[PDB]
Design a protein that fits this description.
The structure is a homodimer.
Chain A lengths: L2 H16 L2 H9 L5 E2 H7 L4 H13 L3 E6 L2 E6 L2 H14 L2
Antiparallel strand pairs in A: 1-3, 2-3
């Protein structure tokens, strides 16, 4: 069974994208919500740069969508997989 | 709120780091609703029993896998409910 290899390939792309405290926090705060870079940096207490690297990771692997308004960059959860995963992690670890 | 969020995201990230590997994910997926031995895992996953031993060592250390030894053969299972739920979700998402 090596279809498990491609399945685990994409799945591990997702997990590696999520296997980080800051990135996981970002993803958790973006669930059922839409936040900006300033809001994320404020609620997570991070510099916009240290936040920008993580957001760059999330954008590159297609876990988040970006929308520009004025001088504000809004982020949202992108794929259904990351939405479901974040929901499950939220139910298991946040309530 | 946030400090507790870190308090739990730490654990969640331990789990995710443990799962953030193709071979380890394959192991965890095969151990879902199942009890496999080192031989079975090494047979279905074409890798040495030593590399498998390293992956299983990771999974044991971070508590994603319970182990019981009977007649010199080591049987592995999924440990906590969190890991089982996450693996089930991953299976539902990437295998169906």
């Amino acid at each position: 069974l090596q279809e498990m290899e491609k399945n685990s390939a994409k799945a591990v792309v997702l997990l590696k994208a999520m296997a980080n405290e800051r990135r996981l926090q970002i993803l958790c705060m973006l669930l059922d919500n839409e936040l900006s870079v300033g809001e994320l940096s404020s609620r997570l207490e991070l510099s916009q740069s240290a936040l920008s690297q993580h957001l760059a990771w999330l954008r590159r692997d297609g876990l988040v969508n970006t929308r520009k308004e004025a001088q504000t960059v809004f982020y949202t959860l992108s794929s259904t997989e990351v939405k479901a995963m974040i929901e499950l992690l939220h139910r298991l670890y946040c309530q």
